[PDB]
Amino acid sequence: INVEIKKIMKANEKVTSDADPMWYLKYLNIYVGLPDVEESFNVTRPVSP
Amino acid sequence: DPVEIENRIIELCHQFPHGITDQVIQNEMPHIEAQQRAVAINRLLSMGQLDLLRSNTGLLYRIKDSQNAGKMKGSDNQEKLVYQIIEDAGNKGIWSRDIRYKSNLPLTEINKILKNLESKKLIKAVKSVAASKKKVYMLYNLQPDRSVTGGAWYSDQDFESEFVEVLNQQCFKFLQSKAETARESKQNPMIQRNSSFASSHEVWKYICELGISKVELSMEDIETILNTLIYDGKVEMTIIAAKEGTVGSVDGHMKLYRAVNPIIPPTGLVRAPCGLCPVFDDCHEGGEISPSNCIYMTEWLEF
Amino acid sequence: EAANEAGDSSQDEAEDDVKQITVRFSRPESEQARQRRVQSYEFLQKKHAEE
Numbered sequence A: 001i002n003v004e005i006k007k008i009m010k011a012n013e014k015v016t017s018d019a020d021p022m023w024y025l026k027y028l029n030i031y032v033g034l035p036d037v038e039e040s041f042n043v044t045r046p047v048s049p
Numbered sequence B: 001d002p003v004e005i006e007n008r009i010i011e012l013c014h015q016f017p018h019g020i021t022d023q024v025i026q027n028e029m030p031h032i033e034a035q036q037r038a039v040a041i042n043r044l045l046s047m048g049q050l051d052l053l054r055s056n057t058g059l060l061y062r063i064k065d066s067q068n069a070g071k072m073k074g075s076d077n078q079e080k081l082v083y084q085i086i087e088d089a090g091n092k093g094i095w096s097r098d099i100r101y102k103s104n105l106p107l108t109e110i111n112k113i114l115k116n117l118e119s120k121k122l123i124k125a126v127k128s129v130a131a132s133k134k135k136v137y138m139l140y141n142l143q144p145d146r147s148v149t150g151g152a153w154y155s156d157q158d159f160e161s162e163f164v165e166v167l168n169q170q171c172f173k174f175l176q177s178k179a180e181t182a183r184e185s186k187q188n189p190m191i192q193r194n195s196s197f198a199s200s201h202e203v204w205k206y207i208c209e210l211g212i213s214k215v216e217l218s219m220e221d222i223e224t225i226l227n228t229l230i231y232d233g234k235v236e237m238t239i240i241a242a243k244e245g246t247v248g249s250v251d252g253h254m255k256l257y258r259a260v261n262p263i264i265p266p267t268g269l270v271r272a273p274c275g276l277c278p279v280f281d282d283c284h285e286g287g288e289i290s291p292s293n294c295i296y297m298t299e300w301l302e303f
Numbered sequence C: 001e002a003a004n005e006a007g008d009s010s011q012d013e014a015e016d017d018v019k020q021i022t023v024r025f026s027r028p029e030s031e032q033a034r035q036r037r038v039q040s041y042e043f044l045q046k047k048h049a050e051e
């Protein structure tokens, strides 16, 4: 989660389509954050195991 | 100066749109060596303004098609890089899907190119009658081929079954009348056969004099109609040897058609409901489909 | 072998094999195909021969 995920994101950082050139989607940095639960209405909250 | 040599070659190509040969180039500029001329031609072909053609007289160097412009919006690069295969197809035409796959360009880009060319009158879109899926694009100057589009039978991508049936009926009536006249003449067997024989050109002129439809019907079209009649089992065709005459269609050969009666009348199998039954395979003594409680034979006996 | 196939007959008539204009499109090559062409052995051999 600290190094390998970043390396994979760097390997697949850029993705583009053949049609309509000059269009691309570039990934800069990926985060995992802390464990949260999607129970609340569009609100995050720390949840225990 | 190689730049001056290239400029002079381009000027000569402009003067001769059909192309120029090494002999013409040498006659125009004799003080330059063949090696320098070849280097100049190689540079021109590498930069992409000249095209090479191999004719019975040798090699021709023609200026690339750039003055004829139908899509000036954007860049002439894609314009010519589409017009190339547009012209290559020409009479046979090419579908939009094939144009896209050959150009490796987006659908929107190719559609814009085609629309601009059609607005500036360089290409025409015609519906493919063989497969009515997309409209093929052809050159506005070339005549549309009959196989890929058009045809004396097809009218607006619709086959004229009634028209072909009328043609067949009229041809069969004419051949039957001719055979009847030949039989009534009863002058000699060979003369009777020769008179019952009908020539392709003769039946074509007869159909033209009739004038059932407005579209011009060709001798080959009438020949195809007569071949369909033969396949129908009503006329017979014979190839005789005649050097030249009023037909002059085939070299040394002439096709003569005559209406002939069938070999034998309808057989006995067709006279029974069992021979014309579509579920004949499922026939069985004891079951749902049984000859005892059959409906086909019941109605056939009631009639 | 090509010359033999051509001279299979004693007298070869003038063949009407005029080279039709088969100018293919310089299609825009995708990045992957361009990298493949660059890494191909023929491209490297031609680059070495250019010198």
Ligand code: SF4
Residues within 6 Å of the ligand: B273, B274, B277, B279, B280, B283, B284, B289, B290, B291, B294, B295, B296, B297
């Ligand atoms: S239903 Fe009667 S007529 Fe039809 S196939 Fe069977 S036996 Fe023959």
